[PDB]
Symmetry: C3
Subunit: 213 residues, 3 copies
């Protein structure tokens, strides 16, 4: 068991969780711009690719905060020890997207090897879920490289007890001397508030500004 | 009775109200940036705090327009003579937010005294609604001070006949020579359209640019 | 018959369509900024008005891509040969909006004549749908000229099998040496993905940068 059953009996956010879960079911999206000036430099002195490093960096930050790793399993509220990213891959020949995942690793070079192999194996597989069933301990990551956006938001009919963060990136752009990346974060309010989203974004920004390895 | 029953029989927006209320239930959110350069200067020559003045200023503008003060009471469509703001307060020890309100006043200094006392009284109260039942004649105001956003949007499951405006502020930032504040406005389309939201924002901007007292 | 019944039996996006249509009903909105510097120049050397040219230009691009012209008719998935725009008109005396449409034409001057006459005929008609029943082969276009927005999003209760794109424009603004127009695109995920929205926006931008006639 790769999760811990959360002591909700005793949880300080108990009232908050039930209000936003059942009283006023709510989630929100917010788009913010990440300075990736430093990151671009780091990439430049390396052989790492952009999409693969963002995946890694987002999964790395989601994995430092518990509230971004919450779920319901057995009608119980759990916390995943770790999450693996499910990212999108564009298929040029069909104009559709496939969703892929691979195991997260604190070792970036091991991450990269995991990524390239999943990519090699399923590159021509235009099914929606080429690997089958999505692992429950996941996060969704996606990228719209062709257009810059100031906003993005998913309008989903029903969102009951779906607590995995959905992260979307747009095309970066030169905003003077800075290179910025619009990143949309969408979460459920039962487990995550505005503070927790801000704390993830401040952490991701830190990481973009640090050495890769 | 602190409201007037609206003559809907005769209302020019009658068809519009029923279409967006029952035919195609709809609301929208929009985020715009308020120049608060002047405001910062005003604050600087004063002892007023930021969050408290924004609250006051938003409640002041919501209180000049009727359509932002609408509601259903008794299955009747009403207009509130006045509304009191319900703002959020962050509790650092629990990572949760409390919602508080206090009486609106055209006298800012009286507003401030109302604010500080409600704050003093409930500062350590991490309940969600420390004061109990929210007053019906309200508006929601909230602030995400830790992160700058270009967009924000609430995804609420059901929104039936909930006509109170929800306003969210982000961290301001220096956009050249200007200090700007992302402000998200979310409303129901039955009572408020794009014109009315724009008219509120143009009015709030005016007010940010004027003397406080 | 102004549509073709789509071979969905054989469609490469078959799985994608049913997943986002029934499994996880989903749509999204995204706001991007269109450089209309060139366009302003073109207008300047002409007698064309802004709202009318944007309408024309958006309808022109929607009409080059099939996926933006999809619908359900007879429980069948169709593609419209062509679509006519339904745009909004502000009535200053009532503070409400009317929705109007007129026939699309590859000849801009013919477009303009169609537009001016529909405008002349229904200018003082504050009904919501002054012309009656909206043509099925449409797109919605709207404009909020009074305020600049970085984001916009419609929160619609139910969106079942409604595949027509909704496009919203804000007030442009001078962003240094460029004049930019925030444009919000909202679509259903069953027929349109992030690639297809980006491809529409890249096409509209091209068109803004080209001669009118
Ligand atoms: Co419950
Ligand atoms: Co860990
Ligand atoms: Co009705
Ligand atoms: Co009054
Ligand atoms: Co089905
Ligand atoms: Co054609």
């Amino acid at each position: 068991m790769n999760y811990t059953k959360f002591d909700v009996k005793n949880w300080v956010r108990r009232e908050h969780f039930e209000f936003y879960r059942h009283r006023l079911p709510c989630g929100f999206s917010l788009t913010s711009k990440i300075d990736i000036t430093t990151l671009k430099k780091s990439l430049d002195d390396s052989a790492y690719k952009f999409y693969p490093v963002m995946i890694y960096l987002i999964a790395q930050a989601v994995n430092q905060f518990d509230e971004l790793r919450m779920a319901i399993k057995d009608d119980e509220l759990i916390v995943w020890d770790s999450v693996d990213p499910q990212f999108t891959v564009f298929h040029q020949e069909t104009e559709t997207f496939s969703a892929l995942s691979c195991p997260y690793s604190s070792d970036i070079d091991q991450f990269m090897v995991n990524y390239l192999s999943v990519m090699e194996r399923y590159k021509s597989d235009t099914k929606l879920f080429p690997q089958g069933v999505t692992p429950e301990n996941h996060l969704n990551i996606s990228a719209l490289p062709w257009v810059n956006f100031d906003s993005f938001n998913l309008n989903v009919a029903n969102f009951t007890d779906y607590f995995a963060p959905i992260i979307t990136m747009a095309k970066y752009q030169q905003e003077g001397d800075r290179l910025l990346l619009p990143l949309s974060v969408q979460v459920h309010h039962a487990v995550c508030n505005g503070f927790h989203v801000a704390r993830f974004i401040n952490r991701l920004q830190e990481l973009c500004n640090s050495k890769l390895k």
